[PDB]
C-alpha cells in the first residue's frame, strides 16, 4: 500500500482522475477470494494527478483520508473524495 497525497490548485479544477467499480482479488486462508473494490479508471490529460506520476490507471483505492472504502458505493466514495479535496490523501494498492 502507498499513501498518495493529491494537491488541489483551482477550486474549480478537478484533482485529475476518474474512479470506477472493480473487483479486488484478495488472500484468505481458504485461498483467493474476489471482493468488490474501487479503482482508478483513467487520468485527466494535463491534470494534477498525472503530473505527479504517483497514481496509475488500475491502482486500487483502499482508503480515503484514513477511511476504508470497503463496502461503499461508487457515489459514496466520490463524495468522500471531493469533500476531502483540499487535502486529499488516498491509500492505494498499486497495480504494479
Amino acid at each position: 500500500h502507498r499513501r498518495v497525497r493529491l494537491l488541489k490548485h483551482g477550486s474549480d479544477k478537478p484533482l485529475g482522475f476518474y474512479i470506477r467499480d472493480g473487483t479486488s482479488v484478495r488472500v484468505t486462508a481458504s485461498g483467493l477470494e474476489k471482493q468488490p473494490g474501487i479503482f482508478i479508471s483513467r487520468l485527466v490529460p494535463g491534470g494534477l494527478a498525472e503530473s505527479t506520476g504517483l497514481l496509475a490507471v488500475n491502482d486500487e483505492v483502499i482508503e480515503v483520508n484514513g477511511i476504508e472504502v470497503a463496502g461503499k458505493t461508487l457515489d459514496q466514495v466520490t463524495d468522500m473524495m471531493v469533500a476531502n479535496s483540499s487535502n486529499l490523501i488516498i491509500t492505494v494498492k498499486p497495480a504494479n
Binding site: 478537478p14 467499480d21 479508471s41 458505493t73 461508487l74
Partner: peptide, 7 residues
C-alpha cells in the same frame, strides 16, 4: 448510476 466518476 454512472460507471465512472471524475475526481
Amino acid at each position: 448510476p454512472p460507471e465512472e466518476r471524475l475526481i
